[PDB]
Write a protein that binds this ligand. Structure first.
Ligand SMILES: CC(=O)N[C@@H]1[C@@H](O)[C@H](O[C@@H]2O[C@H](CO)[C@@H](O)[C@H](O)[C@H]2NC(C)=O)[C@@H](CO)O[C@H]1O
Ligand SMILES: CC(=O)N[C@@H]1[C@@H](O)[C@H](O[C@@H]2O[C@H](CO)[C@@H](O)[C@H](O)[C@H]2NC(C)=O)[C@@H](CO)O[C@H]1O
Length: 151
């Protein structure tokens, strides 16, 4: 059985569970999306001061959001609204789920979520920061496991 980790705030859990339902994941994707958002934005409390603050809860970069708009709209029935927190989480979900499916694993989905499909040790993000996509996937997967992930 799955349950909200006590550290995850109510409003976030609602958002990821809605994402989880849109994928039929039995509550398990919700746990992985919780781990992702904690690392990415600290639920929103870890955004301010960073140059990528404006990219929201799952930290999807502007050019990445642009690439997935029509896909977002098909999956969820409305045009992506970056001001909607629920949409931000819906957008990160769709992309993460697309990588997990495409590459065949959670770990690999996580690595290429943070680094893109062509990440190499040393590559930089849209802000020019180093992307440590291996470390990201290790510690996000550990987190997902602690929260009860089964897969
Ligand atoms: C030292 C440390 O742990 N800093 C954390 C940051 O890693 C985290 O930043 C987010 O990191 C992702 C890479 O791990 C980025 O893709 C994402 O853009 C970035 N978020 C921001 C707002 O810059 C922040 C956010 O919670 O928390 C620290 O724990
Ligand atoms: C969650 C997130 O936004 N991850 C970012 C990656 O998408 C991103 O990758 C780059 O994204 C574009 C997606 O349309 C591609 O045009 C581009 O080719 C791709 N780069 C690579 C190396 O695959 C990276 C880098 O900007 O940042 C992540 O945060």
């Amino acid at each position: 059985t799955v349950t909200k980790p006590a550290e995850v705030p109510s409003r976030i859990w609602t958002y990821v569970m809605n994402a989880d339902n849109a994928y039929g994941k039995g509550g398990d994707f919700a746990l992985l999306l919780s781990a992702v958002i904690k690392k990415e934005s600290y639920f929103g409390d870890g955004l301010s001061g960073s140059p990528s603050a404006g990219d929201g809860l799952m930290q999807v970069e502007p050019n990445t959001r642009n690439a997935y708009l029509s896909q977002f709209s098909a999956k969820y029935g409305h045009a992506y609204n970056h001001s909607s927190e629920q949409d931000q989480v819906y957008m990160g979900s769709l992309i993460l789920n697309e990588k997990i499916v495409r590459f065949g694993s959670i770990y690999s989905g996580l690595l290429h979520y943070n680094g893109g499909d062509y990440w190499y040790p040393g590559a930089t993000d849209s802000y020019g920061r180093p992307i440590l996509a291996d470390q990201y996937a290790n510690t996000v997967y550990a987190q997902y496991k602690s929260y009860g992930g089964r897969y």
